[PDB]
Amino acid sequence: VIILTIAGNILVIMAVLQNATNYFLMSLAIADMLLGFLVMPVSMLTILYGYRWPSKLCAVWIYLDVLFSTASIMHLCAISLDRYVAIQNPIHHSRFNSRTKAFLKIIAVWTISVGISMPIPVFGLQDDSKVFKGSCLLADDNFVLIGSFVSFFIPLTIMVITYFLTIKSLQISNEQKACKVLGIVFFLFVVMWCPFFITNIMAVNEDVIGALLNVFVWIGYLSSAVNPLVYTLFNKTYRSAFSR
Amino acid sequence: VSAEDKAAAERSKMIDKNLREDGEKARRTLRLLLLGADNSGKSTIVKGIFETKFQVDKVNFHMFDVGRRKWIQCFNDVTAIIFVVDSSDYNRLQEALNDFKSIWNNRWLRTISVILFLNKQDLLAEKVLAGKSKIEDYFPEFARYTTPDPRVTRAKYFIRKEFVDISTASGDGRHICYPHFTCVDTENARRIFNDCKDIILQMNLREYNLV
Amino acid sequence: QARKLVEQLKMEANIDRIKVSKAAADLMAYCEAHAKEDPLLTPVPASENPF
């Protein structure tokens, strides 16, 4: 998993075709690469240590991971919205585009990500009760519910509405190649992201739930790895550059 | 730097600020290009270098037509070409086909889409209903062609088909042609509007990696 | 028009010519006498260079 994630992100960044959009693709790849470099090695050791903690590095680690995951999904929401306005009415979308929109969108998504992750380190550093329960796993029910609600209950509603509207608007072969691709992308994303957050919001046999949590957080890491490939694998020039 | 150099740098900054605004204002209009040989009526479709300017649904269009291999490299950023052909003369249809073939397979217009306009269909109707002049005289393959008064429909479908056949022989899927059968017709701006919208839509689909 | 064309050709017909050895020799002599001044051909110091 680690090797695949790092290689995909690295190869896509090197290849990037410098349109006014693909800077957004490079940014998303950077966030995914960051999660793999720091989060993947730690979590691996915890599974091997059988939930052991081989202290000052715990509280900081929980915050760092939250900032990454939040930025990733936020990038997907920004892409969907833009795409919709490019298919409902294309002329007024080609009007308002001044090659500076990418700078604004990149600043806006990153700003929101730091604010949501700002609280976890200050609270965790003071009272280790929240952070370490020697498992270094979050405890507070109220914060978990609020954080999960903001991180994953607003984007799902936005992405679902936008997908329905776009597929409705597209309906004469290039349109039959676009409908298929949109369907594939949405199905992969939802089936790779929903289970962990569903279970976590449900809870708050403890062994069953623990093992399920392990498998599902690894599935989430796998989705982080798959994101960059499918987005740029349908273009021909991307393929040729990849082969070269 | 001395005092003069700082004053000169200030002047340069102001120059640049003006250039940017002019560029955006220029970027808010759509440009076209008009082509047609003679005895076609290019001027009566929307009723050194001449130019017109019109608008529909708060979008601004610009047209350009001169009165040709060497100055054609200048027009390779326009959105669409317009090609007006006559449909009542049978003597010169081969010349119009050869001209269309030369424009479609040029080297600098490999990604610019064409709009067609076959003019004067009522004169075609009268000339084919009189029976004095027959299409079988000039085109041999017309005898066997059967349509997919029925005579007018068969004839006009044959004339449209040969142009589209020239179009689909080798295009590579990067640009396409949009035929039309234009008569006193007063709705020649709505058609161009819809076809330009579709052109930009295909461009946006191509850029977002879906295709 | 053919009268003007043939008149032009006849006027062009009589003109002085020289061998190619002399023309090539003069070309190479000029190219060689002013070699010390070309700044693009021969490299120059950074301080001396304006850019």
Added chain:
Amino acid sequence: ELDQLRQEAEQLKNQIRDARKACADATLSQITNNIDPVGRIQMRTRRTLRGHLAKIYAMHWGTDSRLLVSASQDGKLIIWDSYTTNKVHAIPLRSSWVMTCAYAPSGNYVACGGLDNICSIYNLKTREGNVRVSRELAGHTGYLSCCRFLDDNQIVTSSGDTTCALWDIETGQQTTTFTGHTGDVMSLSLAPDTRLFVSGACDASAKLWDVREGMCRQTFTGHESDINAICFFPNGNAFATGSDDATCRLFDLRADQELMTYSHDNIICGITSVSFSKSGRLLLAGYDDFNCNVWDALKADRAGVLAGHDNRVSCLGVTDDGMAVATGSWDSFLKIWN
């Protein structure tokens, strides 16, 4: 009538070929065999002057060699200062289409024309701190392809209706018209003495014109397609041409015949410009592959390659001092190499 004319023309053409084929005793590449070669040269881009919002079609160095003009398809002309990369002046044109540009030898005027058949002249040093039109020279039938300044009162222009003209600016009307071309005239080059000038057209033949008399002097034909550029050896007794056959050629005046051809199997694209060096050894060239080459002019062996653009290169210019070289492009950025 017709038979005698055709026979006479054929007889004269054969006579001319026979006469010019009695002088060629030795080729050029057989005379300069024992010459030390140039080696390898490398030029790194020293500057890049940005600020245009479309393609660049023309360029011309100042007599001082520190300033330059540049005309774009966005309808604006910009005068730059090469040392500090600052914009001295910005001029907006009435017609967006433009294909040429020039800088007067004194430094008081510039000129430009395009697809509107009119050549307009702008005056630079006035009261009120303005840049306003002085004259609008008209009288051609097709577009203008190149115009070079002779004095502060004379111009020579080459149009696309197979003719060249010499204008006197004050009165506003032509004084001499040169005819005899069968295709559009694409390039015009003056001489260091400013008494003769050469012209190149689209029927694969270049001509040598006299300025005061007004009559063609010699005609050279050695190409397979149209010609897009032309220059003059710094001596004033040779000139190099470039065509759509992806090959360059060096014609001679006194010997009357072609001397050498520069071509490579790998390159098949047409050329768009040409220039010499201050001494006359190097020969620059700009292709449609988005890069330029440097040829050793006495051996026909490549010497170096400049590749800093992404779209084709339109114009190439060399300063009077020879300190630097500037190349324009369709990527809206023109750099300065040393």
Added chain:
Amino acid sequence: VQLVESGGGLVQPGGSRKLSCSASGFAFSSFGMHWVRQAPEKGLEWVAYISSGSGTIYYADTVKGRFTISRDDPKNTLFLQMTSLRSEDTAMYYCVRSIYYYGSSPFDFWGQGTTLTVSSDIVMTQATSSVPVPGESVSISCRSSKSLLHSNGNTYLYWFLQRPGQSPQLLIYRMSNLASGVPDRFSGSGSGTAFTLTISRLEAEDVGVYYCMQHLEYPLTFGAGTKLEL
């Protein structure tokens, strides 16, 4: 081009007065205005400068904090606002226009002056005050506190000639170039810290006072001046 200044008159000490200058016949927006005041028994002294587009503002040490300079592009006017006046401010104020670009010449035109009467630094000095002299060449030398030659190779020295009862006019800019409308007989030569102005074939109406000004850095300081008599 025309420059007109309206204002002035007897003012009680501590009073506030406004001077308005209107320019016509040229593009006001491109040029940058300057304010210069001349004492009755003293040489010209720089007061304030306003940049084109109001980007940069500079003031003299003496008038700093009590003088405000503003301009309106649409009305084509320049305004100077003075408050808390003193006794030593009795003088004549002249409107000056300067444009800065490569090869351009600053301080080309001087507007008509007005009268207002109330009820470190480069030091440049000229040894000769009065010289007695038609048909005989004359030489004027202006000394400098420090070298005015910059790294670029441009030395900034300006020579101004003022006729009796008339506004001063530019003669030589950068110590070599000659201003437009000036006769060829005037010549300028210089070296670091030593500048000499040589005029030959002197004729009538050439009599006047000559001032040497350095533009190397703010504040600009004028020379004492030399008077020519028949």
